[PDB]
Amino acid sequence: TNEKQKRKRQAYESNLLVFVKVHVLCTYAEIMHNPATRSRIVYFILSGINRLVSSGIYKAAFPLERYLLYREWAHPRSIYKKQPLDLIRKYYGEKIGIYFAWLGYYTQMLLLAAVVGVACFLYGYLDQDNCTWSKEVCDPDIGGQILMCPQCDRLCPFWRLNITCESSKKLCIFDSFGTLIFAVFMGVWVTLFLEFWKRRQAELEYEWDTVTLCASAVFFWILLIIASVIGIIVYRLSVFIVFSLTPQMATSITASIISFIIIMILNTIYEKVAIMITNFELPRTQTDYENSLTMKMFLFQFVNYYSSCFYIAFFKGKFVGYPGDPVYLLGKYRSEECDPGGCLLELTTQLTIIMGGKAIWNNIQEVLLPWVMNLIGRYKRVSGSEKITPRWEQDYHLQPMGKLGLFYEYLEMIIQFGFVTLFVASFPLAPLLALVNNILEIRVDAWKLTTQFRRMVPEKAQDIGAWQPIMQGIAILAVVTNAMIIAFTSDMIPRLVYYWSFSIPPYGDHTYYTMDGYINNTLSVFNITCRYRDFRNPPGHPQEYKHNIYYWHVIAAKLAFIIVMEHIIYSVKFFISYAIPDV
Amino acid sequence: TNEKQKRKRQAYESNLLVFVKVHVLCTYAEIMHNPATRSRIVYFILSGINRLVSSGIYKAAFPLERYLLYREWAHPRSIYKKQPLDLIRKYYGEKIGIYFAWLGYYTQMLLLAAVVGVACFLYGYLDQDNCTWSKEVCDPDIGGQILMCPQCDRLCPFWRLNITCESSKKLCIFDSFGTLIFAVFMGVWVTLFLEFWKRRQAELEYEWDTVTLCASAVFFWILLIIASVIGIIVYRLSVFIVFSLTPQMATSITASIISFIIIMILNTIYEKVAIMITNFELPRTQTDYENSLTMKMFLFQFVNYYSSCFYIAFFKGKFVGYPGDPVYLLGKYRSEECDPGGCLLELTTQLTIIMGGKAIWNNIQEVLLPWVMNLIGRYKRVSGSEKITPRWEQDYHLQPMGKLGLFYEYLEMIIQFGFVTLFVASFPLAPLLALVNNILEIRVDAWKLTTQFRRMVPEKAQDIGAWQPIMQGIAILAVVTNAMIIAFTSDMIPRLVYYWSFSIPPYGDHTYYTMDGYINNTLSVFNITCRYRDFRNPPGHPQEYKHNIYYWHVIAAKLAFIIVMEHIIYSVKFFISYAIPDV
Ligand SMILES: [Ca+2]
Ligand SMILES: [Ca+2]
């Protein structure tokens, strides 16, 4: 088979082991409208090998400025001046450039989102007067004797408040007053992050050149959607049994680490069932591979990373019934419940260490797997000199791309943008944590492209393309979810109601507006026949254990901010996208 | 000045009273990419006169097939076969053609919207078993003794039910069961009317060729927004004083006639203040005139026709307070209220005779003002012969366009599409009334173009253009308003609640689901200190005259269908616009 495939390979070099060099040349600059442009036009000559190297008759077809960009841009000692994006036009082109001008805007776009991120902390820390939510809940005279009900069935205490302080003394920097001033700003921010990037990418476009087979692709997927939902809870059933810093702070760190392992394990299966379902029927041509992964493989990650953070945010503390009745999981066990702090703090750590545990892993995986940095420097000293002439000889130990270019390093930032927007009600410093990360990620992704990897073919790509109907398809799901976090996951809207409708002399007993005395006034008692975090009629009502006015009031404040903070921020989506200067 | 302007006019004929003919000719077919095409290219030669004829040095520059299109398409005896749109390409082009293929689709698009329009009547009429809403309300033993409160202050009775039958026997064909089956279909219909027209117009595109000055433009406008709101009520104050078929049927006909006069009078002022505010600052070039009228002049009509139908639908029966307290109109009078039938029937006639009183006026104004039809036929007999050679001599008594082409005849249909969609919860036959109207309007607008008017310059226009961000900007406001009619204006959502939550043994006294006994169970009593149509706590409550569970429940069903029937029909906007065949 050595000579059987040899006669095929020699036929292709006619129409122009020791590695081959390449170099007529002007005659293929007209059929399509600098060394990167030199490596561009030879790939237009080379266009194909899609099936030759994948068969194995060839091994690696490959290309082969550098010095200055190790100093002002890719050095760890690179002081913050400009991020010269214009060089990445001449160095790496506009596949990689449209991601490295994405970040550098995104980094400066996360600047003002972090000063409004420091804003919920700056007067969150400098004040010392909380209304109730760190005053009553931590003075153990007004939030000490609040004897609650258990949640689980067996191995469960009776429970008591004043075990909730260390979570709910630092919850009023994620609940108290800046949270509706930055999550009203974050829905404004993503609807300004998009539309100012549209003004930016057009400016970037002006600076630069210009039913049966898909059924079982989705109907087999929903068995794997619920595989992600059952990923978090069974290893929720593990760690909370073997345990009971210490109360729930270290455990909320710990339990979301354990699922984050299984998140990265089921990540590998998603790399091996996307190919199992696309190789069967309708493989197609070159541009529907990436448009399959955009609609299946990111969508795999969207159910891996986010359909357990949709489990803490949307369907965790629902269906508490008549004897604290769960649904029984249409089986023989008991279903879970939530805690009277707002369920967010057990989301804001799962928000943290799925985000700031991916940015401390998926960059440091791209640091330690390339042999850790500064062996002796890579080739800077002859980068000015360019006379390293067995340099073609010194290759083929270096690592190539795995026929997907930015896609893996681009999905991991859309997952990050899917956490700095879709889940931001809590934790305003998720910009500042992403700020210093996008200080470093714009250095180490600059570092590995400049030094570590084989030089990519400078494929001119115009606009993000396929992830653009996701960045709209996140931002229209985010302003729902930023609303559904302050509605269904945060306890501010019940804190606005009591401040505006339950401390007025109708249904309340105070003269003017004050937030004094909130936690005993906002839950529902459950007889021995204790309070639990729901709003139902107390036992011994006309219609007991069905809802109050006050469930139905704050659900009609909840459904209102899902309506008003949609229709305002959906209209600032209409007003800013009508009234900005294009140039 | 006769010879002063004569020397200007003779200079322009150099570079080529008795009317002039026109006719080198191939040499201007290349600079831009059949008699209509003959009149096209000479206007490209003629391009300009924008300032010459408007000054007065000329009188009318003008152009000058016909026979066959009076027979199969424009005849009253034109049997329904095809509507040959392809002829309007060769006869009138694609300014007028993109409106006459708009209608012919729209007419067939209103076919299925009228069989689902007959659907709320077909089993609305063939059944004779109403649950309650025409049984209790018209058996005068269960809806006879329902003694209500007055609404106004002086010259007002105590009032009683069983005066509401003739409105509420024929209200269960606009409320009972088909209304959530066609208004769920109408939000589906407009989000299928758009997206199938997008597939149609592309098919039509394949068949055919291819801060200070605007501040006081809007801040003076809001004084005229409330001028429209005060247009309806003062002549509401007139007619209801001089009165009291006869009970309220003839009056709901009458009062909406009187405002419809003032609607057409304030229509004339809007034609004379659009020019008053655009001639002052930044007049501009030729294509921002129509984009001024799209954003001011239609917007004038959108407040003329619709900000009194937004007064019956959104802010008519709100702010009923503690002694039935209105707001007092921050003045010294008393503000109004609504009636316990759902406020829709006093909207569905204002829906009718602003729609079916514009389609019986604005077409019949274009019939009787051109001298009523068939004087003797116009020029059909020589249309085959074409030898009427003083035909240029016989013109200049005929009427021209007033420098706006389709715009007036195109605004009046967008106003119609703004009633067959934005206001459709009630009255399913608003397709069938618009069906036989769009049988006739596609004949008489075909008739006046073919016979009555001077032939328009066949200006090739590609897509509707400026009214396309209105047809999206209606359909995103319609699925709000179709929701806000069943929420804020119709009494079905309170009829689903009692059927599902107030006839169950919690808060109700019946075994299984039945709608028996609804009107005494759904209003709130008001002491002499009678029921009124609101849901407040009865006098002698813990917190009296503030709301019930049941206000807050049905407002949380109201805000839910504003949320769910948005997010479903806003996602069928995402699913049909992802999964239809383009070709
Ligand atoms: Ca990376
Ligand atoms: Ca007309």
From Swiss-Prot, chains A, B:
A single Gene Ontology CC term: plasma membrane
Effect listed in the UniProt record for changing residue 354 to E/K: Constitutive phospholipid scramblase activity at basal cytosolic calcium levels
Cysteine pairings via disulfide bonds: 131-172, 138-165, 149-530, 152-156, 338-343
Keyword Nucleus carried by entry: no
Membrane-topology annotation of the record: Multi-pass membrane protein
Binding annotation for Ca(2+): 366, 409, 412
GO function terms (MF aspect): calcium-activated cation channel activity; identical protein binding; intracellularly calcium-gated chloride channel activity; metal ion binding; phospholipid scramblase activity; protein homodimerization activity; voltage-gated monoatomic ion channel activity
Similarity comment: Belongs to the anoctamin family.
Note: The term 'anoctamin' was coined because these channels are anion selective and are predicted to have eight (OCT) transmembrane segments. There is some dissatisfaction in the field with the Ano nomenclature because it is not certain that all the members of this family are anion channels or have the 8-transmembrane topology.
Protein name according to UniProt: Anoctamin-6
Gene that this sequence comes from: Ano6
